[PDB]
A paper describes a structure:
After shortening the AMTS13 exposure to two minutes, however, the mosaicity decreased, permitting acquisition of a dataset with a resolution of 2.6 Å. The AMTS13•rmAChE structure resolved by this approach is generally similar to that of the apo rmAChE, with an alpha carbon root mean square deviation of 0.27 Å for monomer A. In the AMTS13•rmAChE crystal structure, the well-defined electron densities at the bottom of the active-site gorge reveal no sign of a covalent bond between AMTS13 and Ser203. Instead, AMTS13 spans the active-site gorge, with its linker adopting an extended conformation to interact with side chains of Tyr72, Tyr124, Trp286, Phe297, Phe338, and Tyr341, and with its ammonium group engaging in a cation-pi interaction with Trp86. The –SO2CH3 group was undefined as the electron density of the inhibitor is slightly disordered at the opening of the gorge. While this structure does not support the reaction with the catalytic serine residue, it does support the concept underlying our design strategy, namely that the ammonium group of AMTS13 is near Trp86 and its methanethiosulfonate group is located in the acyl-loop region where the insect-specific Cys resides in mosquito AChEs. Moreover, the crystal structure shows that the methanethiosulfonate group is distant from Ser203. Our AMTS13•rmAChE crystal structure supports the initial reversible inhibition. We also found that the strain energy of the most solvent-exposed disulfide bond in mammalian AChE is about 0.6 kcal/mol higher than those of the others in mammalian AChE, according to the density functional theory calculations using the coordinates of the AMTS13•rmAChE crystal structure and the procedure detailed in Section 4.10.
Numbering used by the authors:
A (entry chain B): 4 to 257, 265 to 543
B (entry chain A): 1 to 257, 265 to 542
Write the structure that this text describes.
């Protein structure tokens, strides 16, 4: 009975398991319950804290993945399967995982908390790309990740109802945050230094915790990778949430109480079977059940809240990958496949824009097409294909991020910004997608440090830099190596200079303006064009 | 005659003329100045189409420039060379329909290709007697036959009550056309070839050339065309019948006045009264907008230039078109608040947004925001230096560069052989501030070969640059191709095409081919904007 792998939290005792990291062992405590299972009549409900348990809870394996849609686009293909559930699906999924150094940290170690993405309809803390052993071993970090309910189970709301209030998936995340405050010290973590980080919907979730007062007392810094609370896909209005809820009730044969009761009696998979059929138009990068502006968790829209918020003692690191948009195109944009080079016609390009900006009037769609056309080569399919990707990435990630960065900087926050431009040598997607949404994660978690994975040696040294930036930021709110001259320095992002850095195999390069002209189009012009139809 | 120079006596359809032997750096030229080509458009003929000049008796002296067409005189900067060089340099008069001819001396052996200059000046000003329009250098150095005419400007040239008999509109254009006919009938007497006539002009001169291309009756009077910094399409060169009627009647009101009775009253007002009120009839505070311009009458212009270029066949047509680097700067100092020739005109963002409302007077609030968003440098949105240059670019792009881009595109796509350039050399002798760069109108002195006059103080490289230009221009007149058939060592100037969109730069360095004439931005103006303000 190894004492290092024994811990006492408020609910009782846990036994973790010693794991092998390339350069040493780490303590891992997997599958810790932080809430009463959200099953039966608890479905759609805010989480309750897990009840105490007798004896020693075996905490040595990953628990169930939250019930969610499973991808079929490219069955067997690693590039998609790597995102699929790698454990059994269950509504009983409210568990977190903790990795520490082995032996346990002598003094209180900064805590990093990972929040996975997946459009708010999928994701699991157990995926290999989120393996915390590397940062724990190498940077001596204490790392936490949780599951939170997705799709209908986490975000289906009948706003104002008692039995489907909305945002329960975010409440799951908040509950795990509180658990970390109350328990992390037992593991050698510092509850007074907690950094959230996440990607895609995970980044947006972090963003929402920034924008929701009750969450604020639970962390000190935030890292948002390729996702924001603001923007087209991350939130919906109370009205539109009510709309999608009842339409789904209808699709499954169903006053709120009555409706919600009948929904609670449907097998999980019946709900998932119609998840995708409540969307108001044909679209990409749009998801059926996501956080809802309820005047509660979110008191106003994210855009309102970031405009008027005070972000004084906040430090935030934000960034995007070189090709945010490409991944989404193969999911139903006519012309795109991972198999051909998806060179497209001008006709397909226009068609793709109606889908990419589902909310756009004819005139607005025209404006997008004109802005993104290369008038020197208005009909070259390589340009058209790339352009289609940029529309999607820019509309949904880059410009929302540029927007957020500016507002936080302007309003007191210390902001650091990056763009990730290195395509992994082991990447299974076609070259034309470049560096897609999701593919910086393996580097930040340090997977290339595992030799059996067959990353080049440069990628290994890269991974080490990234882990150092992230953990430095975690320790100090500044990504820069606190004793190290010349890189040169990573400068803060400010509305004036608008400096950000390029993360790739070459040393840090400071650039100015994150797509400034194009984000002006998306952030400043398009809105006028639509709020005037 | 008897003791007169025998090579300066020439007969034309209306009578005998005596010309003058002028000095040019490389030798003498024959000049015939102030040849009347129309009945004085005075009295009951004001606003009326020109009638051919009635034959005269004896030898008409053609040794000096004639009256300049009655017009507004610039007062912005008294005595300043930069403005004065464009001001009238002869007595103002409604009796002003005269043309000028320059030929080699003695006159050429075989029939020489003919160049015809049409001065610009917003359709409210201009004169063929200005120094920058001196044909003596092209005639001497290139052996060209060069012809320039006066045509009526302002109210006298363009005030229209469309439909009416006494003020049909476009008579200024008709003055121009009559001089073209005059050249057809008479230019052989000077050694000119009526079978080889090239039109060239600048600003409203260029738009004029454009309208002759779009007007059937003019089509048979010339073979090739050059448009410098101007087009028949675009926002300032024409008005609808409705708008011209409106401006015509508003002006009559302003001076104290059934169209017949209205026009009849106007014909009694002194020319100066008309000039003194012509700027007051514009719909909005604006730059690069003129009160009295060609009207779309379903006659001279059968439809809009925009329409006609979109649908006409231009198989048989060669055209050279271009722009200067800084088309807009000149206009900013005429009443965009913040700008002056005496300081750097560094402006504020507020002054930039105010300037945009003025430069795009037709623009709704949304359209003007679009313009400002497109032109703001979002890295330095407050930088007074980018704002000043952006303001100049807005004016230049909207009024010239994008209409010209649009024109070259449509013409090439429909038959024409098109050559395109941007002129980028600031004259060492320029009196305007550096911030203005290469302003509207400042290529002209090079094309006409002024730097060849030793007393002028141009640099030697400029003197050589001028010769290159005169060469491209005359080569195009002769052949429909600017390129020297001999010189293949020198880099070639390729036609402009929808496919490649190639054009050359014109500076002290050798020809450099570039691709895309402000393509992205011109998409904004030519494709997006029109659709926008249909809302
Ligand atoms: C986890 N991640 C890949 C990094 C981020 C998530 C990427 C989201 C991609 C969404 C693609 C839409 C999938 C729609 C399937 C419905 C078929 S009916
Ligand atoms: C002949 N040119 C000067 C080369 C090109 C002509 C361009 C004319 C510029 C027009 C300037 C606006 C003048 C407005 C006068 C206001 C008096 S109330
Ligand atoms: C330049 O001159 C004009 C007129 O005198 C003036 O209105 C403008 O403000 C001046 N610019 C500056 C900033 O000195
Ligand atoms: C050219 O330079 C000479 C020498 O100073 C000067 O006297 C003359 O006036 C100048 N001519 C012009 C046109 O400026």
């Amino acid at each position: 009975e190894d004492p290092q792998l024994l811990v006492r939290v408020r609910g009782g005792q846990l036994r973790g398991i010693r794991l092998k990291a390339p350069g040493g062992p780490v303590s891992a405590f997997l599958g810790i319950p932080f809430a009463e299972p959200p099953v039966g009549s608890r479905r759609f409900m805010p989480p309750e804290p897990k009840r105490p348990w007798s004896g020693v809870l075996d905490a040595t394996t990953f628990q169930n993945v939250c019930y969610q849609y499973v991808d079929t686009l490219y069955p067997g293909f690693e590039g998609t399967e790597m995102w699929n559930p790698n454990r059994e699906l269950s509504e009983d999924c409210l568990y977190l995982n903790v990795w520490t150094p082995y032996p346990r940290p002598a003094s209180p170690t900064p805590v990093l908390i990972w929040i996975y993405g997946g459009g708010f309809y999928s994701g699991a803390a157990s995926l290999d790309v989120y393996d915390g052993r590397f940062l724990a071993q190498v940077e001596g970090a204490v790392l936490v990740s949780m599951n939170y309910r997705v799709g209908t189970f986490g975000f289906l709301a009948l706003p104002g109802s008692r039995e489907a209030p909305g945002n329960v998936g975010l409440l799951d995340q908040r509950l795990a945050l509180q658990w970390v405050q109350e328990n992390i010290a037992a593991f050698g973590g510092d509850p007074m230094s907690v950094t959230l980080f996440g990607e895609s919907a995970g980044a947006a979730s972090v963003g929402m915790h920034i924008l929701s007062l009750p969450s604020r007392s639970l962390f000190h810094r935030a890292v948002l990778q390729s996702g924001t609370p603001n923007g087209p896909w991350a939130t919906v209005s109370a009205g539109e949430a009510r709309r999608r809820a009842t339409l789904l009730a209808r699709l499954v044969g169903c006053n709120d109480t009555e409706l919600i009761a009948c929904l609670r009696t449907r097998p999980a998979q019946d709900l998932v079977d119609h998840e995708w059929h409540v969307l108001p138009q044909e679209s990409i990068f749009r998801f059926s059940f996501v956080p809802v502006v309820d005047g509660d968790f979110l008191s106003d829209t994210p855009e309102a809240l970031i405009n008027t918020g005070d972000f004084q003692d906040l430090q935030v690191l934000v960034g995007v990958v070189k090709d945010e948009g490409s991944y989404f195109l193969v999911y139903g944009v006519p012309g795109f496949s991972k198999d051909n080079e998806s060179l497209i016609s001008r006709a397909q390009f226009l068609a793709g824009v109606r889908i990419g900006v589902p909310q756009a009037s004819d005139l607005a769609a025209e404006a997008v097409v004109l802005h993104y056309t290369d008038w020197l080569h208005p009909e070259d399919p390589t340009h058209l294909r790339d352009a289609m990707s940029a529309v999607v990435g820019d509309h949904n990630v880059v410009c929302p991020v540029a927007q957020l960065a500016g507002r936080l900087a302007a309003q007191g926050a210390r902001v650091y910004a990056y763009i990730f431009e290195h395509r992994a040598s082991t990447l299974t997607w076609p070259l034309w997608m470049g560096v897609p949404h999701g593919y910086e994660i393996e580097f930040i978690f340090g997977l290339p440090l595992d030799p059996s994975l067959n990353y080049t040696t440069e990628e290994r040294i890269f991974a080490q830099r990234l882990m150092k930036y992230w953990t430095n930021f975690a320790r100090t709110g500044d990504p820069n190596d606190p004793r190290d001259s010349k890189s040169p320095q990573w400068p803060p992002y400010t509305t004036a200079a608008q400096q950000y850095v390029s993360l790739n195999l070459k040393p840090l390069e400071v650039r100015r303006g994150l797509r400034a002209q194009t984000c002006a189009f998306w952030n400043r012009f398009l809105p006028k064009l639509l709020s005037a139809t």
